[PDB]
Amino acid sequence: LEDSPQTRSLLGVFEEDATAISNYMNQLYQAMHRIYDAQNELSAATHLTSKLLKEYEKQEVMSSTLQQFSKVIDELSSCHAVLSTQLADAMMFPITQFKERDLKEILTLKEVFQIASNDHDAAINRYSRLSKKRENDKVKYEVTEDVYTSRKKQHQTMMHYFCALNTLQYKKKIALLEPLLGYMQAQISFFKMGSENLNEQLEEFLANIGTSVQNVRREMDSDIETMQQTIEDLE
Amino acid sequence: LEDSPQTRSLLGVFEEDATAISNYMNQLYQAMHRIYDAQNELSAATHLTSKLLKEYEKQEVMSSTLQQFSKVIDELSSCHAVLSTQLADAMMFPITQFKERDLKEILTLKEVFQIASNDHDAAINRYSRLSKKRENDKVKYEVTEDVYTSRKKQHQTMMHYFCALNTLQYKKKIALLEPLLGYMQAQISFFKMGSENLNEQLEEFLANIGTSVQNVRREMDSDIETMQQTIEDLE
């Protein structure tokens, strides 16, 4: 990449690609952010539900059954809370930093280059203006010098910008794969830990509660017939 | 429960207890509803993220890596979606019906009793009014008959109300245990199915992506030194 024409040409392609990269990563940032918010809210609601079950007693066999449910639910809420903090740290942080630091840096340097470029166009236009007239040896030297200094400035800001565009090609891949790896690793711990808490003893408990429920339903139907009898007698 | 005084007394206790039951179940309804909404949003955001990863190609080795992530994520989004529909059906439905049908029925019957009671007070007051004066054999018979019919009406609405208060004692237990059992059963399938999708081959894939990421980081650092050299030459 020997000269300015070629580099400027390649800069345009890197810039168009950086625009597509920004559009896709912003969409990914938004989707992941919805996952993060939902998992955070799900942890809080699951912990609130376990908290409420404990508060039942603050109005006894039911009390105790609710305590066991509350204990299992609190274990699952811990899984959800650890997953939330790992999603924030290993998934949200990387995609957020790519958007807030890298993509912003690209726009900033693009603008610094735009201004240095406007400044050089002004010097070239002023050179054209002063070329059309008989004038000072001094202003001639100055207008020429301004072309050189404004072009050097334009070139330097262009390369600062092109270097970041080139590095963006790498950050793009890292910022795509890092949050996905972080997300997946956190899910593996969450499903494994949760799944172990949900054992065969817990299933025995659930089967028995199921039976307790069917029994209450039967007793209800039977006591409704007594109460209807009691109503007729009182009438 | 031989007579009206006793029954009315016991009705007051059932009514106070129904008020405490409504306050607690409404709080439980609200907590569970937050769990339901969060799990629904989490399923949609997880499926949207897998959808976006597939769309990457619609701008190749990255393409393929993103496809594998998208496949694993779509499997987890299926777990989340089945859990959502089971939470709606086995947890939200029972606590919702207890609140929208049972608790509402209690308030309705309580009001029907309140009006029948106001009507009897009016007949008793009218009996007092007509007792203080020399008047018709007919109005006397009528005002007496109105006391009897308004009291019978008051008593019947009272018993309709007391029977529902008594049955509420059973529904209360069923509506507490049913959603909790439904919730827990759905969680067991979700963690088991999810956990199996997250196997040792998937862990091999993740370890290799981790390596791919560290390699991109190295290549980046190295290509940045080349680009800085290229910049100096172009200047």
Which string of DSSP letters, residue by residue, matches A100-131? IIIIHHHHHHHHHHHHHHHHHHHHHHHHHHHH
Domain A1-235: CATH class, spelled out = mainly alpha
| Joined tokens for residue B48 | 């949207």
Q: Rounded to an integer, what is the distance from CA A18 to the centroid of its chain?
A: 19
Contact indicator for A187, A83 with CB cutoff of 8 Å: yes
Contact indicator for B15, B103 with CB cutoff of 8 Å: no
Interacting residues of A19 by C-beta distance below 8 A, sequence separation 6+: none
Name every chain A residue with its beta carbon within 8 A of the beta carbon of B202.
184, 188
Q: Which of B105, B107, B98 is nearest to B25 (CA)?
A: B98
Per-residue b or e along A173-195, where b marks 16 or more CB atoms closer than 10 Å to that residue's CB = bbbbbbbbbbbbbbbbebbebbb
Name every chain B residue with its beta carbon within 8 A of the beta carbon of A223.
166-167, 170
- State how far residue A116 is from chain B, nearest Cα, in angstroms: 16
* Angle at CA of residue A207, ends A201 and A209, nearest 5°: 105
Contact B194 A195 (CB under 8 A): yes
Query: What's the CA gap between A130 and A133, in Å, rounded?
Result: 6
Angle between helices A137-197 and A104-131 (to 10 degrees): 170
Contact B184 A206 (CB under 8 A): yes
DSSP 8-state secondary structure symbol assigned to residue B132: T
A32-35 contacts: CB < 8 A, separation 24 or more?
Answer: A32/A91, A32/A92, A32/A95, A32/A179, A32/A183, A32/B49, A33/A92, A34/B41, A34/B44, A34/B45, A34/B48, A35/A87, A35/A91, A35/A183, A35/B42, A35/B45, A35/B46, A35/B49
Overall resolution, Å = 2.0
* Number of H-type helices and E-type strands within chain B: 6, 0
First vs last Cα of chain A: how many Å apart? 104
| Joined tokens for residue A55 | 């508060």
Contact B235 A155 (CB under 8 A): yes
Contact A206 B191 (CB under 8 A): no
Q: From B44, which residue of chain A is nearest by alpha-carbon distance? A: A35
Give backbone dihedrals phi and psi of B3, rounded to 5 degrees, phi first.
-140, 175
Which method, experimentally, gave rise to this model? X-ray
Q: For residue B159, give the nearest of A27, A188, A234 by CB distance.
A: A234
Q: For residue A194, give the nearest of B41, B62, B191 by CB distance.
A: B191
